[PDB]
Amino acid sequence: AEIYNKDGNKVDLYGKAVGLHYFSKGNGENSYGGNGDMTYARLGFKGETQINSDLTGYGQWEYNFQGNNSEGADAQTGNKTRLAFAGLKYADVGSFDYGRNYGVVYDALGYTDMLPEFGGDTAYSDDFFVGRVGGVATYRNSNFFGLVDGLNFAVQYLGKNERDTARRSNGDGVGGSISYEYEGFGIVGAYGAADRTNLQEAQPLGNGKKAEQWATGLKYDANNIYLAANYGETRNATPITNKFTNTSGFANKTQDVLLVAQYQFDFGLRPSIAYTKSKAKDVEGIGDVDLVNYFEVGATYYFNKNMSTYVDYIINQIDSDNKLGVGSDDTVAVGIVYQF
């Protein structure tokens, strides 16, 4: 909501409350998304200030508050800042921001990250360029300097983040993306590469000094229809766990595909169908193994721009024999959302 607009500065305070539950058999330990209460809230602000006719400054901060914790010792489980960045945008020259922000490969992966609750499986947080990540400098360009309608490109530098776990760490790297959109159609490519830290190199799973991620997308978003596909591959980038040996690391190689189809009826119903598969290769001790493999059926009803509910069912196709011990059971999410 726009809670302040004066002197060329406008501020957006936003947020939501999501009542959310997952249903899966038994513990949910052997399932796609687990089991139980998953309620949470969000709070964020995004600001935009007019410095002059050609120059705008902006910033944004976004936080996640889990609402499925006690008020006791686990009160903080899963809380975090999601975004925190400030930047400048000039004319048709381009924009630059720094902070915690989306890695550039998400420019492609965004095409399919459209499911009510699940999906966007390969867009991992703190995983180089595929998702939200800290210390990223990003240059963006709209309509090629104002010369080409619908053509955008982006260049991003990722600072080194040496953390106490290999999962959330990374070395220095560079990536970029390019996209063209014309009258309903969208196409996008993105690539990123970066050094791995010594801690990542010390993990049992994943072998190499460099990490690489890329992905391409096609979409059609005209009127009430939404169709999109993504394809991508990664080297030493995708985080994995062997539940049998309690071993952790990254996948030497992955190949992923994501498809989504949805339709928005004017009366508020938005049915959804999707497919996602992420395969890993050359995993030490395992070889080839599916990481994600499922169909999705679901729907969201929008009462309005502020209220909605949704069901999201995961027809999980990972088999009970999966060599990594990836969960084989289905998961369904039901939720009710208030946002401003």
Ligand X SMILES: CCCCCCCC/C=C\CCCCCCCC(=O)OC[C@H](O)CO
By CB under 6 A, name the binding residues for ligand X. 19, 21, 98, 135, 137, 147-148, 157, 159-160, 172, 176-178, 185, 189-191, 214, 216, 218, 309, 334-336
**Angle at alpha carbon of residue 283, lines to 198 and 195, rounded to 5°:** 30
Burial of 71 (0-12, 13-18, 19+ CB in 10 A): exposed
Question: Which of 288, 333, 339 is closest to 119 using CA atoms?
Answer: 333
Please, which residue, 124 or 153, has the CB nearer to ligand X? 153
Task: Pick the closer one to its own copies by CB: 63 or 231.
Answer: 63
Among its own copies, ligand X, none, residue 43 binds (CB under 5-8 Å by kind) = its own copies
**CA–CA dist 149, 255 (Å, integer):** 32
> What are 2's two structure tokens?
């726009």
Task: Indicate the residue among 64 and 216 with the shorter CB distance to ligand X.
Answer: 216
Hey, what are 120's tokens? 């966007």
What gap in Å lies between CA 171 and CA 169, rounded to an integer?
Answer: 7
Least Å from the CB of residue 36 to its own copies: 7
Beta carbon nearer to its own copies, 161 or 317: 161
Give me the least distance between CB of 158 and its own copies, in Å please: 10
Name which of its own copies, ligand X, none residue 149 binds, using a CB cut-off of 5 to 8 Å depending on partner kind: none
216 binds, among ligand X, its own copies, none (CB under 5 to 8 A by kind): ligand X
Distance CA 165, CA 200 (A): 8
Smallest gap, in angstroms, from Cβ of residue 93 to ligand X? 15
Long-range contacts from 26-32, C-beta under 8 angstroms, 24+ separation: 26/329, 28/329, 28/331, 29/327, 30/320, 30/327, 30/328, 30/329, 31/316, 31/327, 31/328, 31/329, 31/330, 31/331, 32/118, 32/294, 32/314, 32/316, 32/318, 32/327, 32/329, 32/330, 32/331
Report in angstroms how near the CB of residue 256 gets to its own copies at its nearest. Answer: 21
Nearer to its own copies, 170 or 272 (CB): 170
Complex with its own copies: residue 36 or 287, whichever CB lies closer:
36
CA distance 225 to 263: 5
Minimal distance in Å, beta carbon 242 to ligand X?
28
CB 313 within 8 A of CB 158: no
120: left (phi over 0), alpha (psi -120 to 50) or beta: left
Residue keyed to tokens 């990542």: 200
CB of 165 to ligand X, least distance (A): 19
Task: In angstroms, give the least distance from the CB of 338 to its own copies.
Answer: 3
Nearer to its own copies by Cβ, of 46 and 281: the residue is 46
Choose among ligand X, its own copies, none what residue 178 binds, the Cβ cut-off being 5 to 8 Å by kind: ligand X
